[PDB]
């Protein structure tokens, strides 16, 4: 099974110093531990105002559950990931990647 490159996208507002992050049920997504979550980056290639994206390599045919959160990625006091808010009243998101390249546009944060 030759790996699947998945672009996960979500839109929303953020506080100063805050970013969007993806966390989930496999290594690449940090095994539900926000400390090992993946921070998204702003996506400007479509001319949107509030779009964020993360490109993640996942194993083909393996089901993965995930959620977005908004939080802070800080430097050590002596790393620190602080979740402000996990996505709103909705079931954890899921994907079973089958293609080599996939774009998952999850719309608006919390929806």
From Swiss-Prot:
It comes from the Eukaryota. It is found in: Cytoplasm, Cytosol. Substrate binds at residues 70, 84-85. May be involved in the negative regulation of skeletal muscle differentiation, independently of its glycerophosphocholine phosphodiesterase activity. Residues 3-111 form the CBM20 domain. Belongs to the glycerophosphoryl diester phosphodiesterase family. Widely expressed, with highest expression in spinal chord. This is Glycerophosphocholine phosphodiesterase GPCPD1. The gene is GPCPD1.
């Amino acid at each position: 099974s030759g790996p699947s490159q998945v672009a996960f996208e979500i839109r929303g507002t953020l506080l100063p110093g805050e970013v969007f992050a993806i966390c989930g049920s496999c290594d690449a997504l940090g095994n539900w531990n926000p400390q090992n979550a993946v921070a998204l980056l702003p996506e400007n290639d479509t001319g949107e105002s509030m779009l964020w994206k993360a490109t993640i390599v996942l194993s083909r045919g393996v089901s993965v559950q995930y959620r977005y959160f908004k939080g802070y990625f800080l430097e050590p006091k002596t790393c620190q990931v602080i979740v402000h808010k996990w996505e709103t009243h909705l079931q954890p998101r899921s994907i079973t990647p089958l293609e080599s390249e996939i774009i998952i546009d999850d719309g608006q944060f919390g929806i």
